[PDB]
Design a binder for this molecule. Structure first.
Ligand SMILES: CC(C)CN(C[C@@H](O)[C@H](Cc1ccccc1)NC(=O)O[C@H]1CO[C@H]2OCC[C@H]21)S(=O)(=O)c1ccc2c(c1)OCO2
Lengths: 99, 99
């Protein structure tokens, strides 16, 4: 699809077999999801945003489907205010910015 | 142009007479610029993301040229680590997400 930006670019995702809503976020290097139970091994990591740094659980090689497009990659889980889909997965679904 | 997302989508902007690098950020509702001394009236605002909130100064009807495309709108200035072009100006330059 071609998505305009007068509204938040929110899309449905599927992760861990569960449906969620997430924001397509070209300003995010990484994909960061609100706290949830997720099957897979994880390691603790720190990530910084506009307000400071938070602790997250890093899950490697996670299956995640984004608006019908399948990806497999790193998903960070922690106290983010919003589920954000970052560039690590936006590249996998072939996403570009155009103007 | 078409901008792939392998790397951060940094473009050159012109604002307040200065050339700067800024992120084309679909996850940002508002445009937020690193500390600079703009003229004119402003009002305080708090914006939140990963890590919490930062206090910023809100300037209205600011002219910004983004990769050769002119825009005018609300610009927030504060201790952000990165210059962020948000959806309020991305729509004005005709920017879409495509996949
Ligand atoms: C978290 C999302 C919902 C909001 N953010 C825009 C993001 O694109 C932000 C933009 C951002 C980029 C770099 C540093 C700080 C902010 N990126 C970010 O936090 O990404 C983190 C996750 O991946 C990592 O790569 C970048 C930081 C890490 S933001 O910068 O906090 C932000 C910008 C404009 C706003 C706002 C919040 O509230 C209203 O107007």
């Amino acid at each position: 699809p071609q998505i305009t930006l007068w509204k938040r670019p929110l899309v449905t995702i599927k992760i861990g077999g569960q449906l969620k809503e997430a924001l397509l976020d070209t300003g995010a290097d990484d994909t960061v999801l609100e706290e949830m139970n997720l099957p897979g091994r994880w390691k603790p990591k720190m990530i910084g945003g506009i307000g400071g740094f938070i602790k997250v659980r890093q899950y490697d090689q996670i299956l995640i489907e984004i608006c019908g497009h399948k990806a497999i990659g790193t998903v960070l889980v922690g106290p983010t205010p919003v589920n954000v889909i970052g560039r690590n997965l936006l590249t996998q679904i072939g996403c570009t910015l155009n103007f």
